[PDB]
Amino acid sequence: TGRPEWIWLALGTALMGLGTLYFLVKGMGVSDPDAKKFYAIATLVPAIAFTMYLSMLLGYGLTMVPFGGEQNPIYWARYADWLFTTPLLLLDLALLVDADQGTILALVGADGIMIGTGLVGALTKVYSYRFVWWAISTAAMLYILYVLFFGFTSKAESMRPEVASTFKVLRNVTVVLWSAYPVVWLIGSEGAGIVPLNIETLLFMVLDVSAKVGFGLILLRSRAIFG
Numbered sequence: 001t002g003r004p005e006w007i008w009l010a011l012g013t014a015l016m017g018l019g020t021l022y023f024l025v026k027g028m029g030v031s032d033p034d035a036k037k038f039y040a041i042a043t044l045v046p047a048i049a050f051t052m053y054l055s056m057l058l059g060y061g062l063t064m065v066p067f068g069g070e071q072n073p074i075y076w077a078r079y080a081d082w083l084f085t086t087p088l089l090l091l092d093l094a095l096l097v098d099a100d101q102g103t104i105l106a107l108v109g110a111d112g113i114m115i116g117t118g119l120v121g122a123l124t125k126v127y128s129y130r131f132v133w134w135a136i137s138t139a140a141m142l143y144i145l146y147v148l149f150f151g152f153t154s155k156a157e158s159m160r161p162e163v164a165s166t167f168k169v170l171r172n173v174t175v176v177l178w179s180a181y182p183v184v185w186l187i188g189s190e191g192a193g194i195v196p197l198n199i200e201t202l203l204f205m206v207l208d209v210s211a212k213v214g215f216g217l218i219l220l221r222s223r224a225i226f227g
């Protein structure tokens with residue numbers, strides 16, 4: 001097929017793979033139980049992304065959806081990825097600040113909605129309805145971000161400064177990167193079709209990698225993961 005976006009996907013496949021192996025090798029060495037906990041979670045994240053980037057690189061996870069008079073290319077493998085990686089990332093922030101079970105469940109549930117409605121919207125054939133779903137998905141995301149900024153940060157102040165400071169960074173990177181996804185979707189192939197697929201894939205790969213390997217590197221090299 002040789003599609004214009006394949007290179008970004010070949011690049012993102014390689015970064016997710018490298019990041020996975022490094023986190024894997026580093027965590028197989030750690031003896032502390034909950035350091036292990038954080039390692040196990042942070043390694044699985046890019047591992048999943050890798051498999052998905054790799055499947056897409058290989059021609060899977062792609063579907064043509066009809067709307068706006070065109071046969072639009074929609075990479076659904078993405079949601080298969082995010083469906084499990086996004087909640088895992090949230091779990092990590094939750095474990096860091098000792099979030100409560102109820103909080104966690106609510107975050108993972110909101111997260112389920114966000115990716116679910118997102119996909120439904122990416123698949124919708126009535127142009128204008130694609131944005132209704134998008135809207136809902138974004139609302140869900142905002143709920144998540146609100147909790148993290150208002151809820152979590154608050155509980156991160158019952159921990160040691162080292163832990164609170166590691167959390168604020170991770171919280172920050174997350175707020176900035178996550179915020180970007182809905183905008184990329186809106187102006188990209190799934191939305192207005194203004195940014196071409198190849199550039200769109202480049203944006204997502206930069207965000208996916210930053211948010212997973214970038215997030216992992218920061219968290220794992222901190223002593224806040226120790227019991």
Ligand SMILES: *C/C=C(C)/C=C/C=C(C)/C=C/C1=C(C)CCCC1(C)C
Pocket residue numbers: 049082085086089114115118119134137138139141177178179181182185208211212
């Ligand atoms: C490793 C992947 C990460 C951290 C992915 C984060 C993805 C989002 C914050 C996605 C959000 C979306 C919306 C708010 C609405 C439209 C559809 C999505 C799923 C692209």
